[PDB]
């Protein structure tokens, strides 16, 4: 074969006769499968699944927020040349844990 031969095969012969129905039924059962995965996966696989679901929920919530308002700073006023700017001559870390001589 050569080039887009699977696409040409679909153009000349189509797909399986139940392909659309099976895809629709699988998309319908996706909710049941997702809930079953949430309530039945075990261990590290379950932890990774839960973290990824939390990620998609955050992303979907932000997308819904952005579609909701598609149609819609310091305290003291300072000029543009004083923006993004900030005695005791202390270091950033003035105290750390002491290290014993066995360590």
């Amino acid at each position: 074969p050569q080039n887009e031969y699977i696409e040409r095969h679909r153009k000349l012969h189509g797909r399986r006769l139940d392909a659309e129905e099976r895809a629709r039924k699988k998309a319908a059962r996706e909710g049941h499968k997702n809930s079953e995965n949430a309530q039945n996966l075990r261990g590290l696989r379950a932890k990774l699944y839960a973290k990824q679901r939390h990620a998609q929920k955050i992303q979907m919530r932000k997308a819904i927020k952005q579609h909701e308002e598609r149609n819609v700073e310091p305290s003291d006023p300072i000029p543009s040349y004083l923006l993004d700017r900030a005695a005791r001559f202390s270091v950033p870390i003035p105290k750390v844990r002491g290290i014993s001589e066995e360590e």
């Binding site: 005791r88 001559f89 202390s90 270091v91 003035p94």
Partner: protein
Amino acid sequence: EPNRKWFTNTRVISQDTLQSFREAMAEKQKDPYTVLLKSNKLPMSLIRHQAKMTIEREPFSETFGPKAQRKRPKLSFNTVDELAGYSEQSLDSYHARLEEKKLLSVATA
């Protein structure tokens, strides 16, 4: 303890002094039979992107893929005559390299 000397420059040097030091030290590396005296007290710390640009100008997604917008290839020839000459010299170099590799059951370990 807080101190003012934490926030000061500890080693400074001028333009001409740095340039003269670098030139003299390079002249010293020119001779392999001349070695420094007290080299631990010398400021030896002073002595000692095409891919990125192409990716910035043309991303991978715009080059090849379902969202690709690339339409004009980058060529090393301008007209048909230089194209023919390019093909001829490319074939000659390819044959010469193949002869070089030919001149240059599995084997035992």
